[PDB]
């Protein structure tokens, strides 16, 4: 149930809230909405056990 952001392209200002989720890209080839080469989904689960 708990979702966290892995990394962003820039630092976060204090008291800033982000709602929309976009595909992370760290290369020349665009993701185009598909988590392929050098593309990772920033939202992940904690997985508490």
């Amino acid at each position: 149930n708990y979702l966290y952001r892995l990394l962003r392209k820039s630092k976060l200002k204090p008291f800033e809230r982000d709602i929309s989720t976009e595909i992370y890209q760290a290369g020349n080839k665009p993701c185009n909405g598909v988590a392929g080469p050098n593309c990772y989904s920033p939202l992940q689960s904690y997985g508490f056990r």
């Binding site: 200002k13 204090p14 008291f15 800033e16 709602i19 929309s20 976009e22």
Partner: protein, 73 residues
Amino acid sequence: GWIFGTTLDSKTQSLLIVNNATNVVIKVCEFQFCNDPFLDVYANNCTFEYVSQPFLMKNLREFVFKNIDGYFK
């Protein structure tokens, strides 16, 4: 009218101020816009709402707005 935010075509909650002779509506939500943002005379993650006094009452109104540390002055 004053629009504060990053992107207009969704993707970012946008601060919206509507000023007239009756009430001031301060609202930071998504909302739907066309290519011409204007107010006519004759949605997903809506969170912030506020109601305040009307701002307005050889007529110059010097206005300075500040956005520091998440506070609007």
